[PDB]
């Protein structure tokens, strides 16, 4: 996360860290939607251009974390995966359209002060909150900058980062990139004339774009960090997978594999 700040403890209890099992390394973000299902970006698991094509056995998820690298004994929960499910219409060749995937935990996880699921939006909530100007929140342990600092690096945070960003009008998103945008993705970020900044960066993919409902005061995951063109650049915006538009797929996968 670029231009964000340290999250507070338990601020994003549905935050999941996707980990390579062996060798051990942070791969992406993800989110907890129940005691056995995790949601993430499809390209975090399958992306040929980078020779990525993981299976259930190559991964691990770390739930309930705050610190990026410390093993948080009796607070975080480490789980293996039973199965991975990528959207059948996921398009990694052109625009990462339908960049979404589900991962089923090998064993249900217990909830606690640090582990709790986020809600998935219903049609009305999505229709009311997904509008230009409304702000959402993005969290992650990805890099703090796009550019390299001589003899230091791009910068990694010690704890979970968070940043609030406004949803942007389709026309402006469309005019900001030569990439072909679809109805299954939306973009967020500040306009150059707005002064404030912030964005997701390398390593934040898969993490959730959430909004707190003013109708029932519950947190909803409206999007999944997907892609961009450089982090925090003026006139550019981050793109997120439109979760509600793919809710039917999520429901299908869970219905025939959940039990």
């Amino acid at each position: 996360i670029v231009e964000g700040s340290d999250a507070e403890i338990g601020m994003s209890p549905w935050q999941v860290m996707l980990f390579r099992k062996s060798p051990q390394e942070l791969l992406c973000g993800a989110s907890l939607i129940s005691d056995r299902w995790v949601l993430t970006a499809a390209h975090c698991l399958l992306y040929p251009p980078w020779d990525k094509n993981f299976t259930e056995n190559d991964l691990l998820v770390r739930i309930g974390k705050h610190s990026r690298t410390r093993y948080e004994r009796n607070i975080e929960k480490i789980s293996m995966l039973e199965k991975i499910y990528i959207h059948p219409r996921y398009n990694w060749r052109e625009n990462l359209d339908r960049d979404i995937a589900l991962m089923k935990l090998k064993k249900p996880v217990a909830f606690s002060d640090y582990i709790h699921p986020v809600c998935l939006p219903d049609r009305e909530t999505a229709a009311s909150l997904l509008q230009a100007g409304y702000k959402g929140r993005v969290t992650g342990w990805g890099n703090l900058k796009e550019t390299w600092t001589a003899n230091v690096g791009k910068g990694q945070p010690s704890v979970l980062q968070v940043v609030n960003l406004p949803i942007v009008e389709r026309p402006v998103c469309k005019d900001s990139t030569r990439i072909r945008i679809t109805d299954n993705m939306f973009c967020a970020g500040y306009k150059p004339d707005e002064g404030k900044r912030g964005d997701a960066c390398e390593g934040d993919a898969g993490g959730p774009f959430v909004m707190k409902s003013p109708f029932n005061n519950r947190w909803y995951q409206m999007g999944i960090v997907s892609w961009g063109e450089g982090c925090d650049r003026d006139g550019k915006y981050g793109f997120y997978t439109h979760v509600f538009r793919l809710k039917k797929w999520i429901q299908k996968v869970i219905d025939q594999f959940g039990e």
Partner: protein, 427 residues
């Protein structure tokens, strides 16, 4: 700084799972009866040039020697040896050995297997090939610094036979030197002369040697290559290097981006990367997936494995993180060679009739190699950076854990160097 970078002990963590106790293991029954013979035939020779076939076998010997040598140091020690130097020294020394003493050497060094490979191959071919190889590696400059000394030193009271003196010189561009180990002035003049000949690279060649030594092998090598794709210096930053499942240490980490060959080996559970040096030589970096997987990697390394890795690699743009380091070792290979089966040679009763008419006892085979690895290299390799960027972690080959490295001369398939970096902060 105020943060811990913890390795996760998965077995320990998951052993606390509730269903751990419900595991159903296998009983070791009365009897079974089964097996599968061996025979590590060398069908690796097909299409291989004459010099490559000899180097494939020299490599086979090198890995066996490494296997023995590593069990004589700590698992946390770095290791560095120059296999080609060891093999040529034994080839050279065998010029004056006879009988079984000679046979053990040719057998264990795998020279016997080479002569057997083809009908047109004879012991003379070995010496001829070493003569050619030696010239190419040390008597020519291809773009890297490779300084070396590989001679015999025989106490003056034991005159060296003429035929040996001249053969060593002709086939190995080396010398069987007269020496006086009990004379400090000899040590000084000699160390000094070697320094001048090696332009200051190889120093203290004959230091700390028993004054009663009758004969010893001196093999010192200095190496420093230049990267084809150099590591830009602004990318060099401190990075955590994982020593083991519990400790980490900050080291200078070099970083770059370019098209490099690499592969993921599922059989030996490791990642392999190839880095090109100017002059037709390359460094092969092998990092096991699990830190506890180093012992099995070392245990199964063979020429066949290396060829399998080489064919399986693919070229792709990737970021590379390699710690800079400098290894300087000084071993006495006698004990190791004995364990491999070469014993008569190191016993006074061994037959070295070809070297001297007197009985000589060899107790020291000094093998001292030095290698420096830093960001120096020719240059560039475009500093691209564009648009479309999926936001997951990118493809990088990160050498931040104990690794092995093999340095090969491409044209001859010669294993120049082999090492293990368990800790880049030490030498």
């Amino acid at each position: 700084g105020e943060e811990d970078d913890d390795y996760l002990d998965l077995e320990k963590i998951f052993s606390e799972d509730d269903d751990y106790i419900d595991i159903v293991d296998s009983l070791s029954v009365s009897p079974t009866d089964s097996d599968v013979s061996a025979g590590n035939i060398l069908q690796l020779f097909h299409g291989k040039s004459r010099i490559q076939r000899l180097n494939i076998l020299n490599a086979k010997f090198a890995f066996n020697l490494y296997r023995v040598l590593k069990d004589q140091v700590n698992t946390f020690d770095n290791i560095f040896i120059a296999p080609v130097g060891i093999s040529t020294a034994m080839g050279m020394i065998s010029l004056g050995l006879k009988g079984e003493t000679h046979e053990q050497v040719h057998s264990i060094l795998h020279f016997k297997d080479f002569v057997n490979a083809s009908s047109k191959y004879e012991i003379t071919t070995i010496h001829n090939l070493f003569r050619k190889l030696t010239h190419r590696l040390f008597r020519r400059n291809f773009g890297y610094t490779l300084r070396s000394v590989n001679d015999l030193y025989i106490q003056k009271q034991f005159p060296i036979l003429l035929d040996f003196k001249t053969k060593v010189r002709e086939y190995y561009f080396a010398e069987a030197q007269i020496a006086d180990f009990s004379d400090p002035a000899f040590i000084s003049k000699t160390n000094n002369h070697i320094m001048k000949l090696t332009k200051g690279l190889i120093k203290d060649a004959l230091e700390n040697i028993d004054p009663a030594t009758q004969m010893m092998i001196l093999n010192c090598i200095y190496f420093k290559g230049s990267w084809v794709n150099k590591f830009p210096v602004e990318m060099t930053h401190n990075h955590n290097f994982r020593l083991n499942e519990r400790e980490v240490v900050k080291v200078s980490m070099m970083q770059t981006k370019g098209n490099f060959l690499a592969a993921n080996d599922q059989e030996l559970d490791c990642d392999i990367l190839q880095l090109e040096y100017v002059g037709g030589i390359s460094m092969l970096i092998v990092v096991p997936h699990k830190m506890s997987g180093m012992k099995t990697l070392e245990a199964q390394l063979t020429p066949r494995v290396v060829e399998r890795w080489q064919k399986s690699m693919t070229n792709r743009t990737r970021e590379v993180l390699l710690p800079k380091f400098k290894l300087e070792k000084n071993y006495n290979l006698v004990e190791s060679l004995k364990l491999m089966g070469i014993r008569m040679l190191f016993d006074k009763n061994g037959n070295m009739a070809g070297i001297s008419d007197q009985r000589i006892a060899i107790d020291l085979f000094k093998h001292q190699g030095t290698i420096t690895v830093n960001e120096e290299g020719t240059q560039a390799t475009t500093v691209t950076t564009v648009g479309f960027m999926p936001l997951s972690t990118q493809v990088r080959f990160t050498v931040d854990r104990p690794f092995l490295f093999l340095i090969y001369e491409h044209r001859t398939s010669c294993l120049l160097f082999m090492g293990r970096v368990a800790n880049p902060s030490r030498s």
